[PDB]
TrEMBL record, chains A, B:
Alphabetical list of Pfam families matching this protein: Pentapeptide
Superkingdom assignment: Bacteria
Residues recorded as bearing Cysteine sulfinic acid (-SO2H) in the entry: C40
Protein name in UniProt: Qnr
Lineage of source species: Bacteria, Pseudomonadati, Pseudomonadota, Gammaproteobacteria, Aeromonadales
Annotated coiled-coil segments of the chain: none
Modified residues (N6,N6-dimethyllysine): K3, K5, K110
SUPFAM superfamilies per record: Pentapeptide repeat-like (SSF141571)
PANTHER family assigned to the protein according to its UniProt record, in alphabetical order: BTB_POZ DOMAIN-CONTAINING PROTEIN KCTD9
Amino acid sequence: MIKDKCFEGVRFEQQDLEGEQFQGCRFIGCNFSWLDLAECRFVDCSFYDRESEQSCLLQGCDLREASFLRCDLTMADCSRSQCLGLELRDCQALGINFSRASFANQITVKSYFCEAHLTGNNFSYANFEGCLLEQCELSGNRWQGANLFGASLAGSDLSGSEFGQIDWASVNLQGCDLRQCDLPGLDLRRVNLDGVQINEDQQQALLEQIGLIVFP
Amino acid sequence: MIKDKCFEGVRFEQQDLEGEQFQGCRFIGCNFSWLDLAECRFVDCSFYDRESEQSCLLQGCDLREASFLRCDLTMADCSRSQCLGLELRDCQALGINFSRASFANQITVKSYFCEAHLTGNNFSYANFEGCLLEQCELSGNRWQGANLFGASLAGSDLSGSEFGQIDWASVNLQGCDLRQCDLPGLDLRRVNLDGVQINEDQQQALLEQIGLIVFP
């Protein structure tokens, strides 16, 4: 257990991550890239320095079954990482980069399935371009200004999201639980919603979007 | 006022209609074709004989501002007739033929209007193919099996209709009042309902049609 430490400008080595538990630590301008962080747990840790605007690098990391609770991951570069089973709970993740990250188990050449547990996070302006998070737990996040271009979230629980005006047409949402979400601008003529779950109170806005007038 | 008279096999001439009013009459195998019936009034009259299965011909009639109230117009041939302002209320009109009939004042598509007052009628298996009936009073009718192919009902009050499984994609319904109508199989991706009025209780079936799952 590593606690209450401040690391500044550190290029970490594999040996430094061995105990795999961090609590109340500050990581300022640190590089974890291409290291094995599988099963590591971080609680109440900062990876972003407000004053210097320094962020951390986690490019190509093994993050499989890593967990982050109440961390500040603002601007963290997690691109190209292995993220099967990754858990992010209640994190500040403004501008987090997951481009080219996998959340999948490529079990054979023919088959894969995804797993991820991402809840209560601020993913405002995050980069999830091209990412597959299918049949994952993705509920109760904020996604305002996030890049979901070419992503597939098919079959995932996205209940209780704060979306804002997502480019709905460029993300696969088939089978998604979209209950208790704002869906502004979502045009059912341009977006496949097959198997999507909604509440009765979301019906009117979808129909008004395509020109219907709904009376009591 | 011509009252409780029976006419059979009769080829009518124009003079026979100067007494513009008829009540409780029967017309069995009668021909009104190419006559001016403008502003004529028929109440509780029959134009169709059941045991005989004989119907009447009204081909190319001037039926403008004419009125039929609680009349049996089953199988009547009104093809090619002028019907601007025609009123049919609470008529039995199974199989009525309005092929090539006009309900419009349309010299050009740049400025025109339609008019018709067709309410409470049984239009089961009626032929309205290609008819322009826009912004007309068309409420409370039964349309089971009617040919509406190429018809435009845009802007009309169709509230309280019994439609059945209409070919929705080949009739113009934009701006229509469809409150209290059955809309079975109406697929929003294929059918433009811009400006259409519906009630809250009609939303779920429309959205379920395109694959959404609606919860309380």
